[PDB]
Each structure stands twice: as C-alpha cells, then as structure tokens.
Design a protein around this ligand. Structure first.
Ligand code: RY0
Ligand code: RY0
Lengths: 236, 5, 236, 5
C-alpha cells in the first residue's frame, strides 16, 4: 500500500482535506489506507469512506452511461459504424468502475464486515456491499450477471434483517438502506412492485416514529424520507 | 434517475 | 450457453472427437456445456473436462512465459524501450488466461464440488481448484496475490486431507494431487523444503503399497511416481 | 519446468 507509511490519524485528516478540495479520488485513497491499518472505523470514518467512494464511482457511472448511450446509438440500423473506439472506451471506463467496486468490496470483506458487531456499523457496511454489487450489476452482461444481482440482494437482505431487529424505523442508516434496496428492486431486479412496496412501508413506519425524535434527528430522518417520496413520485 | 444515498 | 441446445451425450461425444482432432478449445467448450447440464460427471467425463482445460490453459501459460520473458528483457537497462506493445500483448494473453481459470473455477463452484460426495470425485475437483488458482498465482502481482495463493493452498489441503483418509497411497488421483501440490510449494509458495518432503513421502508411501496392485494399476501408479522422482531430481 | 498432471 502506498499509504502504509502514513499515520492513521494523518490519513483521516487528509481525507477530510481532500473532501473540502473536492478531490474524491485522493479522499478514497486516504480512506483505503486508513481501513488497511486494520482497526475498526468510527461513525465519522465510515461516512468518510462511503462519501469518497460513492463520489468516485458516481462519476464513473455517469461517464459509463454517457458512453453506453453513444454506443447504443452507433449500433442502431442507419448510423455509421465508424469502428471499435466507442466500445473500447466504454469498456475502459467499465473496467475502471469494476476495479473500484472490487476495491471497496475487498475492504468490506477484508475485514470490515467480519469485525462489525454493532448494528450501526454492520448494517452500514452490508448496505455498502449491496450498493457496490448493484453498481457491478448495472454494467454486467455475462455469465455472472445473475450471481452479481443475487450477491447484492443477499447483502441488502441481511442488512435489512438486522436493521429491523436493532434500529428504530427512523434511523437514517435503516432509511438509507431501504431507499437503496428499493432502487435495487426497481432498476436491477425488474421488481417495481417490490420497490414501491418497500419505499411506501419504510416511509409510513418512519412517519409514525417521528414523534420520538429531537429536532436534529427529525431533520436527518425526514431528509431521507423525502427521497423515498421522490422515488415513489417517479414510479407511480 | 432515482435517489440513492 | 451456446451449448444449451445440444444433448449432454452429444456434447460428450463431440468432446471425444475434438480430443482426437487436437481441438482442445472446442473440447473445453463441449465439456463446459456438458457440466452446465447440471448432472454429476462420471470418471471418464471428469477426465475429459480436465484434459480439455489443462491443454487450453497450458498453451496460454506457455505463451505468457514467452511474452513475459521478452517483456523483462525489453526493460533491462541497455535495451531499446520501443513502446507499450510487449506489455499490452502480454496483458492480453494474461487476461485470456485469467478468464479461462475463472471459467473452470466457476464450474467447480457452480456446482461440481458441492455435489461431489465420493472421494474420487471430490478430491479430483478440489485438486483442479488448487491447480487453477495456482495458474492465477503464476501471473498475479497485485493486492490479491497472497489471497490467490492461499485459495490454492486451501483447496489442495482439503483434497489432501480427504485423500489420506479415503484413498490408498497408490491411488493415481492421490498421487497426482501430491505431485501438483508439491509443485505449488516449490514454484508458488517459495517452500522448496515442503515441496521436496511432500514428493519424497508420497513416493515412499506409494512404493510400499505397490504390492497390492494389479499389473494395470501398477502401471498407472508407477507412471506418476516417476514424475515425483523426476521433480525430486530437478530439485536436489 | 516441473511435472504436473
Ligand atoms: N462527509 C463527511 N465528512 C461526513 C458526513 C457525516 C454524516 C453524519 C451524519 C449523517 C450523515 N448523513 C448523510 O450524509 C446523508 O444521509 C445518509 C443516510 C444514511 C446513509 Cl446509510 C448514508 C447517508 C446522505 C444525505 C444525508 C453524514 C459524518 S462525516
Ligand atoms: N483423455 C481422455 N479421453 C481420458 C483419459 C482418462 C484417464 C483414465 C485413467 C487414467 C488417466 N490418467 C492420466 O491421464 C494421467 O494420470 C493422471 C493421474 C491423476 C490425475 Cl488427478 C490426472 C491425471 C495423466 C498422465 C496419466 C486418464 C479417461 S478419459
């Protein structure tokens, strides 16, 4: 590891600086270095890790979608099949995306998840595992597409089972997990009814628990609840 | 595209 | 699967024909199709599968070694760094090799090993799993090299434990497993002493059991025993 | 190279 000689605390501090500078590839490399020190991560640290890689892979996904759209248009009957360049460059971006996903999944498997005993850490990491298999599923076309989809589903399902036993319905990790698992159902699993049912049940159960929250927790929970409603408005 | 976090 | 419409028995017959024609890529595709029918494989069928892929990957390994040797020579101080072509083409062959290994490992995991209850099938498949992780290890350089090596070791070790409980010391599967695990130790694990000890103990225990064998079984066992001796002569 | 089977 290129970060192996840097102090854990220095890596975390530089991740925070990279975030302020909108240098998310650096942020992710710093947080990968911090994870590789082998100690469990605090709440703030888990969110630094997640924010870094979600921004990196988010940029790759956006680029891949542009390139895939160009590629599909270049293959419609009535175009001008220039040559291999669009496919080649889409594949390059795709391979880089798959490499980032594999890196994150490797950090979760070695060894974040197995050491995560508290619900807030374990559910957070299993949600991430579902998310990064979902990103792999978005680009998958070959013999392992069903298996990638089921790996996402299985991770999300374990996270949901823990969250329903261990967290209140307004817990923002529980809400964000359900938001993303609902998107998995709609966009990946071709299960729009399951996606709508999950988002609606999650929203209604959170609504009925809002009265227990402080003003600050209320703001956190209702933010994700609005995203659930936004998706339901898109889908219905 | 749908919202995720 | 491109073979999904062909009868299992027709796939096996064509694998045998491809072997006679020295068309090992076809042989492997036919046997992959046969495995994907989902039924367990007979002894003959397991050997058809193994022979096909060992010849395919064997050709790739030989090509990769030539290209890697050229690449290393082109990087020595005092050459003529033409450009990226040798590295690019070595990487192309390497990626194709890794894809074949992943295909075989996928067949073993989905679902040959889990349905293999008899020692002769289970040890055979676990030996193959060790072999194809070993081939991946031969080209591995990055963050997963140690993990690939340990996956080979673990598969070989489980196969050895079963073989020592369930098979006589002259059983050719047991012998071939030990031959290859010994090479794993020498060439992959940097454990030449373990490689020599395993080959010598395997040879001596087989020697002492030869008296129990028919003339045909004697010929089978002593053939692999000679390979053990050949390696020991190379290493000592 | 060493023999394997
Ligand atoms: N960037 C950073 N330096 C840090 C961010 C946080 C942090 C702290 C509390 C809450 C959150 N919450 C979020 O950011 C959002 O809510 C989420 C809810 C659930 C999940 Cl699972 C993920 C996100 C995304 C939109 C609001 C962040 C610590 S440090
Ligand atoms: N080609 C084919 N149509 C088939 C070959 C076989 C078959 C039958 C009996 C023995 C063997 N034995 C081998 O071929 C060798 O011994 C091995 C011993 C152990 C292991 Cl694990 C693998 C090979 C490699 C050199 C001799 C093959 C059936 S069908």
């Amino acid at each position: 590891g290129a970060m192996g000689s840097m102090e854990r605390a220095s890596l975390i501090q530089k991740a925070k600086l990279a975030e302020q500078a909108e240098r998310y590839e650096d942020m992710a490399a710093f947080m990968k270095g911090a994870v590789e020190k082998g100690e469990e991560l605090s709440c703030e640290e888990r969110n630094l890790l997640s924010v870094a890689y979600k921004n990196v892979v988010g940029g790759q996904r956006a680029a891949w979608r542009v390139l895939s759209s160009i590629e599909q248009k270049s293959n419609e009957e009535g175009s001008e099949e220039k040559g291999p360049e669009v496919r080649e460059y889409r594949e390059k971006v795709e391979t880089e995306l798959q490499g980032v996903c594999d890196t994150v999944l490797g950090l979760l498997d070695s060894h974040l998840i197995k050491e995560a005993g508290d619900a807030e850490s374990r559910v957070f990491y299993l949600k991430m595992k579902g998310d990064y298999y979902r990103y792999l599923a978005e680009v998958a076309t070959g013999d392992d597409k069903k298996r990638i989809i089921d790996s996402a589903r299985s991770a999300y399902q374990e996270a949901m089972d823990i969250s329903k036993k261990e967290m209140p319905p307004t817990n923002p990790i529980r809400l964000g997990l359900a938001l993303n698992f609902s998107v998995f159902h709609y966009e990946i699993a071709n299960s729009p009814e399951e996606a709508i049912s999950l988002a609606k049940t999650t929203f209604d159960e959170a609504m009925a628990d809002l009265h227990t929250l402080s003003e600050d927790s209320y703001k956190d929970s209702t933010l994700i609840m609005q995203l659930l409603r936004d998706n339901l408005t898109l889908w219905t | 595209f749908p919202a995720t976090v």
